[model samples]
Target chain A: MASMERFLSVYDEVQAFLLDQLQSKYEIDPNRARYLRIMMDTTCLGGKYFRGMTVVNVAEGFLAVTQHDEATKERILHDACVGGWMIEFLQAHYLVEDDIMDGSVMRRGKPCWYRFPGVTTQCAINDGIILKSWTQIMAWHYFADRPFLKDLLCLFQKVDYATAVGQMYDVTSMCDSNKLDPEVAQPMTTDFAEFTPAIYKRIVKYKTTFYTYLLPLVMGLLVSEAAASVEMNLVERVAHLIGEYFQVQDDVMDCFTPPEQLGKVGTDIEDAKCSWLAVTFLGKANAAQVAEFKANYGEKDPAKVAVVKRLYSKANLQADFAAYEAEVVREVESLIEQLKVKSPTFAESVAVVWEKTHKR
Target chain B: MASMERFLSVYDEVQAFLLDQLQSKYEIDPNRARYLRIMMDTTCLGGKYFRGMTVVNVAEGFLAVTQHDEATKERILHDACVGGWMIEFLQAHYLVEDDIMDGSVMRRGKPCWYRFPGVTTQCAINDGIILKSWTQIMAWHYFADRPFLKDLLCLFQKVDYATAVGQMYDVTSMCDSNKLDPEVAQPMTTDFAEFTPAIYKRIVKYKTTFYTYLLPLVMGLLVSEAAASVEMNLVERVAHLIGEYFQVQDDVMDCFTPPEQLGKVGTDIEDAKCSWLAVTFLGKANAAQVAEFKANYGEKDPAKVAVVKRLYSKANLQADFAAYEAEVVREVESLIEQLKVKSPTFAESVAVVWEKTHKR
Candidate 1:
C-alpha cells in the first residue's frame, strides 16, 4: 500500500515536475541539452524505480503526520516529488558509468548509451559528470533553503563517494584479476585473489546497498522534514538487510535466471563480475575442481560457461540460495518489527520495497 | 604579495590538514586508503598550485582590513585553507578522468594516473570518485557552518557540470571528428564539421574558464566573505579574458613549442585535438590548404606531423598568434583598467593570475 497508494498519483506528478525543470534547463541551450536529455531517457526510462519510489513513499508517510497548510503542503510535495526523481537521476548517473566499468552492453533492453549511435565510451564517461552536475544543481534549487539542506546535499555526495569507493574496490580487486579491458566483448578476465567475504560485503554495502535502498528512505525523510521523528540507527539497519539481501539475490538471479526473465545479456560469467556463487563455490570446490572451474570460468564460449554452471550445480549451491533467502527474511522481519512499533508507516513503507525485491 | 606572505605558512598547513583528515578516514580502512593516498600524490603532487593559491590569497586580502580574532579567525582560516585545497582536489579529479578522456600518458610531468603501472585505467577511473568524495566531505567538515557554504558547494558542482559539458563538446566535436578511440596509440582521427568559433567559445568558457579563472576568483571572494563587497560581473569579465587567453596560448604552444619546452609527449597535432592552430588554419587557409592540413593532422607519423607544421607556417599562424596575444593583452589590460577603480586587492589578485598565464 505504501507504494501502490502514492505511486501512480504522485509518480506522474514528479516525472512531469523533473522534466518541467529539465525542459527549462534545455531551453537555456537546447543544442547542448540534446545529448544530456537523451542520456536521461536511456539510462533511467525503464526499471522498478524502487529507489526513487522509496524516497516518495517516506515523504508520503511524513505529510500525513505533519499536515501542513494548503500552499505549504503542495510545496513540500513538489520538493518530495522532485527529490524522488533526484535519486532516479543519481541512479541514472551510476548505471551509465558502472556499465562502462563492467563492460555491459544491454541496459534495460537497449544498448548502453556508450554503445548508442553518436554516444561512445568517451561521451559516456563525460555523461557521468554531466548527470552529477544536473543533480546537484537541482537539489540546490529545490532543497538548499530547507533546514535539512546541508545534510541532504551531503547525503548525495556521500552516496556518490561510497558508491565510487565501492566501485574502486571492485575495479582494484579485479585489476588484481588475470587480465584487464573494458572493451572486451570477449570473456571478461576474472581474478579471485581478493574474493573474500570481507571485501565482498564492503563492496556490496558501499556500491549497491546505500544507493539502492537507504538513500531513498533517507531522502524522503529529509525532504518532508521528518528526519528527527525516526531513528537513524533503525533506518540504516533496515537498509543493510534489505540492500544486502537484494544484491545477493541479484547474484542468484544472474546465474539462474533465464534470458526472457532476466535480459538478453545476463551472462555474469562471461563478464566475470563479482558474485556470491563464484565466491561460495571457490570456498566449496576441491583442488582439481577448483582448477577446472578456473579454466572454464569467464570464457566467452558457451561450452565453457556450461561447465562452470555444471560445477555450480554439482557443488549443490542451488539449495544454498534458499537457505540464504530464509535468513534474509528472518533478519529483515525482525528489524521491521522493531521499526513497526516506532512508526507503522516507516515499517510499512520499507515492507513495500522488501516484497517487490523477490521475483520468486 | 598576497600570495607570497601567506604562501609558506598556510600552504603547508592545508595539505597537512587535508591529509590529516584523510589519514583519519583511512584508519577506517588502511588497506583501502593505500591507493586513494597514492592517487592524491599522483595527480596533485608537482604542479603550480595556482587554483589553490587564489582562494587563500583572497582570504588573506579580507583579513588585512577586517582583522579577525585568534579563535574566530583561526576557524575561518581553517575553512578557507581547506577550501583552497578542495579546489585542488577537484582539479586532480578532472585531470585523472580527462587524461583518460583524451588519452594522454603524462600529466604535469609524470605518467597520467590511468597509465601508471599497477593502477591501470579501471582503478584510475574510480580514483576520480574517491578524490571527489574526499573533497566534498572535507569542505563540509570545515565549511558547512559558514554563510557561503551553499554557494561554495554549488560552485564545485558548477565547475563539474560545465567542464563535463565542455568535455562532451570536446568529445562529440571529435567523435564528429575523424575517429573514436580512447585506446588509440595510433593517430587520432580528426573531424571538422563542428569546429566553428561558437562551439569552441562555449567549450572554453564551460571547460577552461569557469574552473581555471572564474571559479578561483569567485571561490576566493566567497571564502573571504567579501563577495557582497565586490561586483560579480567584474569578476567574471576578468576571468574570461585571463582564462580564454590562457587556453588560446596553450593551443599556440602545443603546435609550435619543442619537446623540452613543452614535454616529451606533447602532440596535439598527432592526437588530432581541437586547437586554435587547426581552427585558425582551417579558417585562414584555402580549400587545398585545408585538404593538405586534414591529410597530415592526427597521425602519429613524424613526417606527416612535419607536413602539418609546414602548412601552419605557410598559413603563418605563428605571427597570427602574436596578433592574438596582442589583442588578448589589449582586452585584458582594458578590463584590468576598469577593475583598477574597484578594490585593489581584487584587481591585484587577478593581476597575479594574468601575469602567470604567459610563457612567451
Candidate 2:
C-alpha cells in the first residue's frame, strides 16, 4: 500500500536524528562515528518494516472512516512511525549481538558491526545496549503530550519484554543439541504427522508471532480512537495466525526458492532452525530414510546437504508447503470473518492485515 | 542509622519480588531458579542503598519537618524502594555479562551465572538483556502516575547506557597488555599514575554513583516538589568524590585487609585489574623493582606474587596509600563543606557518606 511507501520515506529523517543523537551526545570520533552510521543504516535497511508500517497503515485506514481531523491523523502517523522504529531497534539490537555470539562474518552483505575497526567486542555490547535504550527515549519524546501516552508507553514496554523472551527462546533453541539433529535435514524433536500443524504452529507463534505482527497492529489500535479492550483481543488472535504462517512461508521458501529470488544463503541447515518444512519432511520419511536422514543431514559435508535435498524432494516438501500456505490462508480468512462479526473496527484493521498478506 | 537499616530490610523484600517475578515470568526450574536467585542476591546485597534509600530517607526526613500525611510518606517509600530496586537491576544487568567478559569464577561464594547449568555463553547475554528490560518494567509500574514520570524514566535509561560505556572502558583498560606490566605491578602508560587512577575512578563513579546515589536523590527531590536542576550539579560533584573513594578504599582493603575482616581473597592482582593501588605502585616503583614486580605479578605464579609483595613493602607503598587515603578524606571533607552551603539536604547526605569512609 501507499502507506508502506510513506512509512519508508520517514526513514531518512529517523536515521539523521539517530546519527545526530549519537554524535552530539557521545562525541564519537569520525572513524567510529562513520562506522556507527553505517551500522545503523545497514541493519535498519534489512528488515521488512511490515511491523512498523502496519501501525500507520491500519491507523490511517481507521482514521479515514472515523473522519478524524488532521491533528489526530498526525498523531496517529507519529505513533505508527515510532511503533515501526521500535521493531527496527529490536532487530538491530539482536543482530549486533547475534553476530558476535555466533561468530558471524557478514550480515546484509556487509561486515558485521563488531568487525568494524575500533569497534571492540566491548563497544559492540555497549552499542547493543544503547540501541535498545534509545527506543524508549524516542517514545517518551514523541508521546510526552499525547492523551494515550501512558497506554503507548505501557504497550511498548510490554512488547519489549515479550520480544526479549522470544529472543531467549531463539538463543536457547540454537544451543541445545537435542532440539535439532545435527545430521538430519529435519528436526528430530517433533513427530508432526501424528499431530496437527496447529501444534507445530504454536511454537512458531510464541517464538515469533506476537512481537512481529500483533504488536504493531495493537500499537496502532492503541493510538487510534477506536482502541478498545475487545478489539485488542481480536487483533491479537488475528495477528498471531498471520505471523505464524508468515514465518512458515519464510522457511518453506528458504528451501524451495531460487537463490536470486531469496537473496541470501539459506540458514535452514546451518542454524538447525525448526520450521514447518523440516517437520513435514521428517513426518513423510520412511523409518530407514529417517534414520539415514538423522545420521547424514546437517553435517558439514556437502554430500550430506545433497542427500538431504534428495530426501526433501522425495518427501515432496515443496508441494507440502504450497498446500500448507493455502490452509493458512483459509484459517486467516475465517479469523477475519469472526473478527468482522465481533467488532467492525477490529474487522477494518483485520482487512488491512489481510490485504498486506495478499500482496506479499 | 535506622533509615539505613530500613533500606537494607526493604532491600530483602525487593529481592523477593525480583526472584518471584523471575520464577513466575521465566518459569525457571528450581535449580536454575536457585542460581538466578543467587545472582540477583549477590548484586543487590552489598550496596549502601544510598540511591535507593534516599527516596524514602529523604522523603521521611523532609516529611519529619513538613508533617506531611502518611499517604505521602508511603508513596515516597514505594518510589524510593522501587528506585533502589532499579539500581540493583541495573547492576545485575552489567555484572552478569561482566563476569563472563572477565572470566570470573565465583560471585558471592556461588558460581557465576554463566557457569550455572543450562547457561551457555549466549544465554548469559540474554539473561543480561532480560534483566535490563525488567528495570523499565519496574520503573513503569512504580512511577507510572508521577507528574515527571517521563523524566524519571529517562534517568534510569541514561544510567543503563552510561554504565555500559563505563564497562567498555573498564574491560579494555584491563585487556590491553600495554596498560599492565607483568613484573612492574603498574602500568607502563605514562602519567600512568594519574590517568589510570582517573579512569579507574571514573569507572566506579559512572558505573555506580550516578544511578546508585545521584539518581535516587534527584528522584526524591523531584517528587518532594524541589527543583532538580540546582541540586544536580552539587550532587554530581559529591557523588563522584564519594563513589571514587568508596571504590578505591574497597580495592585497598580487599588486598590489605585480613581474610577474617574482608571475608574473601582479593582478585585485583590475579585478575590484572587496573586498580588505584596498582597504578600508584607503578608510579613510585624504581627500574629494578618495576622489572622484578612485572616478572612476578599477574602470572598467577605464587612466587611472583611474593616477590611483588616484598618489592611493594620496600617501596613503602602501604605508607603511600595511607597518605593518599588521608588526603582524599580531607578533600572529601572540604567538598562536603561546599555542598552544605550550596544545598543543605545534599550536604547532610554527604555527611552520611563520610561515615562510610570511617567504616574503613
Candidate 3:
C-alpha cells in the first residue's frame, strides 16, 4: 500500500510538470502566463485528488506485483503519476465549464474560476479548452512510445466525449428547470416518475463512471504488464457499479451532509437537479406528499427547502439510502471477489477506492 | 487548379462525415442530437473554406508529383479530404468560442451559434470542446496507420495550443478596451502607438496565420512523400507573410468595404480590436487627427464610426493599404518563385491562397 506522503508528493510533481510544460512549450505573454500559472495552481491542485491518487496507487500496486526491474518500475511510476495528473487536468477542464453551466459560485471552498476577479465567463470557456489541450499534450508526451499508447489515447478521447455528451444531457434536461432563468416558470420538474432509476443509472455511468472510476483504473492498468491479460469489459462493469454508488452517495450527502462538512451549501434542490433524494422520496411518498413535493421541490426559498427536507425525512430517505448503500457494497464485494482470482492487485486497488469513498 | 464544383462538394462530404460520427458514436437524446447537427451544419459549412480547400488541393498536388499507385492515390485523396475537414472542424471550434468571446451576434449572416434560440453560451462552450474531440477522433481514424501519424497528431496539438494562447493574448490585451464593459472612460484604445505594427504582426501570426495557412499546408505536406524531405520552417515563414497580408485585408475590409459586401457590419472599432488599419492610421495621422481618432474609436455610435472613417480617409489609408498590398504580393511572389524549383506543387498551392486572399 502507498503511504499518504507518496500520494501528497504526486500533486507537487504534477504541478511542477504542468508549470514546466507551460513555460517551456507555450509562448504566452508575461501577464497571461502569470494568470495561467494561477489558473493551474487553483484548478489543478488542492482537490482531494481521489481520481489521481487512484491512478498512482493502482499503478504502483500493479507494478509491485509485476516484478519489473527497479528502474523500469520507477519510470512506470513516474509516468503513472503523469497519467494521474492528466486525469486531474481532465477534471479541471470539466469543472471549469461545469461551473459556468451551473452558475456555481464556489468550488472546493474558493470562488469558482469564472467568478474569480478579472475573469469573465468568456475567458473561463477558453481556459477550459486550454486545460483540455494540456491533458492531451501531457498524455502524448508520457505514453506515446508505449505499446498501449493508442488504446490510452482512444480511452481518453472516448471518456472526454462521453463526459461532454453526458454534460449536454445534464444541462439540457435541467435547462427548463433552472432557477437562474426566471422565465422558466413551469420548470420541468424531475420527480420519481420522470427521472427513473434507469435514467439515473445511465447518467451516472456516462457522467461519472467513465471518467471518475473507469478512467483512473483503466489508465493504471493500461500501463501495467497485465494490461494484455485483463478483461477491460469486466473492469468497466465493476467500475460503473462503484461509480453509481459514489454518485448516489454524493446526491445523498449534498442534502444530508452539514454545510461545514460539504464546504458548500447544497444546491441540488435549488438547481432542480435530478437527484437521488428527489427520485427516492417520489417513489415512496403518497398523493398528498407528492403534491407537497411538487410545490416545494425546485423552489429557491428556505421555507420550500425546509418543506422538501421534511418530505424526505417523512419518506425515510436516510433509511432507504442505508439499504441502497448496503446493496452496492454487497455487489461491489462480490465483483471484487470474482476479480481477486485473476488479479489480486487490481482487486485490491478497486477495493481501496470502495473503502475510501464508502468510509465517509 | 481544383474546380469550384469539386470544392463545393468537399463541404457536403465533411458535413456527412460529422453527422454520421455524431449519430453513431454519441448516445445523445433526439433533441440534443438535432441541436448538434444544426450546430455542425451552421458552424462547419458555408465558409469560404480556404483552409480546408488548401489541405485537399495541396495534398492532391503533392501526391500527383510523387506518382503513387492509382489505388494508393485514391486512398490518400480520401484521407486528405478528411484532413481538410479536420481543419474546418478546428476552425468551427475556434469560431464557436471566438463568437462567445467577441460577443458576436451574427456569423455567415445568421445568429452566432451561442445566440441561437434555446442555446445558452454554456452549451456553446461544450460544443466547442465536442468539436475539438471530433477533430481528434477523425484524425485518429484516418491517420492512425500512417508513418507520419505522430507528426500529424503533434501538429494538431501544437496548433491548438498556439491558437488558444493567441486567443488569450487577443482577449486580455483588449480587456481594458471592450465597449461592452462600459467602465473605462478612456478605453485602452488600440491606437498606432499602443498597438504597434510588431504587436499586430505577432497577433496575426499566432491567431490567424498558423491555423489558416501553415496548418493546412503543413498537414498536407506531412502526409506526402515530401514529408521527410521538406523544410517546414521555410513553409511556415512564407505562410505567415501570406497570413499577415490576409488579416491586413480583413482589417481594411472591416473599415473600408460596405457592410453589405462583408455580410456583417464591422465592430473592430467598437470592439476595440487591434486592427491593422488602426495601427497604420495611427502611424500616419497628425496630432489633432490622433486625438480625433482616440476620442471616436471604440465607440458604438455610428456618428463616431463616421468620424473615425473620415480620419482614415484623411490619413489616406486606402492609398497606404494599396501600397501595403503591393508589397505583400511582391514578397509572396518572390517566396513562391524561390520555392517553385524545389516543389512546384507547394509553390502553386501557396500561390493559390495568395491569389484568393489578395484578389478582393
Candidate 4:
C-alpha cells in the first residue's frame, strides 16, 4: 500500500507534463484559444488516475532493483504517465460520444462536449476519433526509442480492440433486448445488469480494470522486472478482482454517495445502465414489476426515478448488492491467499485492494 | 485513361476483400453483419480508384531502375486499394454522423446507418472511429515487417488529423448562425442568408477535400517513396482544384442531377448548404431577390425549394457554375502546361482530372 501511494505521487508531475505538451502542441485557435484548455479540462476530469499511477507505481517497484538514478526514474515516470493518460484519453473519447448517443445532458457536472457552443453535434463524432488518435500519437512519440515501444503499442491496440468489443456488446444489449441467447447470455448476465453480469464485470474489468488497473499494475511490475517473476495468470486474476471491486463500488457510490462529493450523476438509474442491479432486477422481478421497473428507470425522468427507487426498496436490491459485495471480497481474499508464491508487488497489490475494500 | 480504368477494375477485388475481411472478422449476427455488408455496397458504388492508382503510378516513376514483379505489383495494388478505400471509409464515417447531425433521412438510395433498425445513432459514431482505426490497423498489419511501416502510420495519421480539423471547421460552419459576429450576424438577420463565402469555401476545403481527394493524392506519393518529389505546394494546389471542382459539381448536380440516379431528394437548398449556388446568390442577388430568397429559401418549406430553384434560374446560377468550371479547367490546364519540370505522376493526375472535367 505504501509502495502504491509512492507510485501515485508521480501523477502530479505527469499531469503537469501532459498539460505542457497539450499547450505546446495542440493549443491552436484562430479565435478563442481557450478551446484547447476546455478540451484539456474535459479529458482530465473523471476517474482516479489509477491507471496512470499504476504505470509509475510498477516502474518504481522495478526501479528498486534497477536502482537507476533520478534520470531513469524520470524516464520510467514519463512513459508510465503518457501510457496511463493514453488510456484516459480513450475513455474521454468514448465517454463524450456515449453522452451524445445516450442524450446525456451533463457529465462530470458540465455540459457534454457535444453540447458546447461552437461545437456542433457532428463535430463531436470526429472529435472523439481525434482524441483517441492523439493518445496513440503520444504513445508513439513517447516510446519512439524505447525497447518496449512495440509491446506498448500492441498492448494499447489490444486494449482498444477489447474496449470496442465490449462496447459492441453494450450497445447491442441496449437496442435488441432479445438478441442475446437465453442460455449463453443469461447466466453471465447474473453479474451486472440485464447485460451478462460476468460479461459486464469483464467489460468493466477490460474497460475499467485492464486499462485502469491491470496494465498499469503489470507495467509497474515490468518496470520493476517483477513481471517475469509473477505468473501472468495470478496477476490477471488478482487484477480482475480488484478492478471489479472498484467498479462495483463506483456504481454504488454514484447512486448512494452525497451529491457534492459524488461530483456526477448516478448512472444505474439514469442511463438504463446494465449494472449488477439491472441484471438482478431482470432475473428477480415478476413480469409486472419488470415492466414497471423498466418503464420507471428506462430514461431520465424524475417521477419515474422515484418509482424505480421505491421498487428497488420494495425488492431490497440494495441488500442483494451488499450480499454480493461480501461474496466478492471473500473470493478476492481467497484468491490472494491462493497465490503459491508472492512477490513484494503481489503483496503490495493485495494490501491496496484490502484497504480499498475496507474503505468502501 | 487505360491506367485509370485498370485502377477502377480493382474496385471489384477491393469490394471482395472488404466483404471477406469484414464477414470473417466482424460477423457476429444478422443485424451488424448485414449493416457491414450494406456499408460496403454504398462505399464501393463507383470511384475511379485514381488515388490508389497514383500510388502505383508514382512508385513506377520513383523506382526508375526496374519493373515491379507480380507480387510487388499486387502488394502495391493492395496498399493503393487500402488508401483509396480509406477515403471511402472516412466518408462513410462522416456521412453516417452527418445524417444524424443534419437530420437527413437517406443516403445513396438507402437509409443512413443510424436510421437502420437495431442500430442506434450512437453506433454510427463508434463505427466511424472503427473505420478510421481499421485504416491504421490494416496499414500496420500489411506493412508490419516492411520498411515503410512508420511512414505508412505517419501518412495515415496526418490524413486523420487533417480530416478531423476540416470536420471541426465544417461543423462550426453549419451551426454558427447563432454565433456570428454582431455585424456579420446583423446582415444574416436582415437577409437571414447572408453568409461569408470565403469561410464557407474554406470549410468545404477542409471538411470535404483534404481527406476525399488530397489524402489519396498525397498518400500515393508517400507510399511510393516519392513524397519528397511531390512538392507540398503543388499537391495542395492540385488538391484544392480537384476538391473545389468535385464539390462545385456536387452542388450543381444536386439541383440538376436526376434524383433516381443521384439518390435522395436533393435538399441542398432546403438544408441551406453553403454551396456554390448559395455563395453566388449571396454575392449576386439584388435586394428584392435577396429578400425574397431569405424569406422563401432560408425557411424549410418543400415549396420554397422550387421557389429557390426559380430564384436561382433568375440569377443564372447554373450558367455561372458552368462558366466557373470552364475557367477553372483553363486555369488548371495552363498551370499544368507551365510546369517547369513535371513527374509523370503529376501528368497522370492531370490526365485523370481532365477526364473527370470532360466526362458525363
First chain TM-score for all predictions: 0.86, 0.83, 0.91, 0.78
DockQ of each: 0.31, 0.22, 0.36, 0.22
Q: Against the true structure, what is each candidate's TM-score?
A: 0.88, 0.77, 0.91, 0.78
- lDDT string, candidate 2, A107-200, tens digits: 6556677776546455576677767766766776666787877787777777666666665555434233333221223233333232235545
lDDT of 1 by residue, A125-202 (tens): 778766666677678776767887788888887777767766765554444433333222222334466566666777
Task: Give model 2's DockQ, 2 decimals.
Answer: 0.22
Each candidate's root-mean-square deviation in Å? 4.7, 6.4, 3.9, 6.0
What's the lDDT of the predicted structure labeled candidate 1?
A: 0.72
**B-chain TM-score, every candidate?**
0.87, 0.80, 0.90, 0.81
- Please provide, for model 4 over A65-110, each residue's C-alpha lDDT reduced to its tens digit, 9 standing for 90 to 100: 5667788777776666666667667778878777787676677666
- In candidate 1, the residue pairs with backbone N, CA or C atoms under 3 Å apart (3 or more residues apart, or in different chains) clash, namely B174-B177, B177-B191, B178-B190, B178-B191
Q: Top lDDT: which candidate number?
A: 3
- Give the lowest summed-lDDT range of ten residues in model 1 chain B: B178-187
Question: What are the per-residue Cα lDDT tens digits for candidate 1 across B94-121?
Answer: 8888887677776655677777666666
Better of 1 and 4 by lDDT: 1
Candidate 3 per-residue lDDT over residues A289-359, each given as its tens digit = 98898888777899999988888887888788889988898989988988877888888998999898888
Q: Among all windows of ten consecutive residues in candidate 4 chain B, which has the lowest summed lDDT?
A: B180-189
List the candidate 3 regions with Cα displacement exceeding 4 Å.
A1-26, A175-193, B1-26, B175-194, B301-303
Q: Residue A215 in candidate 2 has what lDDT?
A: 74
TM-score-superior candidate, 3 or 4: 3
lDDT string for model 4 (B68-88, tens) is 777876666566656666566
lDDT of 3 at A154: 79
Model 1's TM-score against the true structure: 0.88
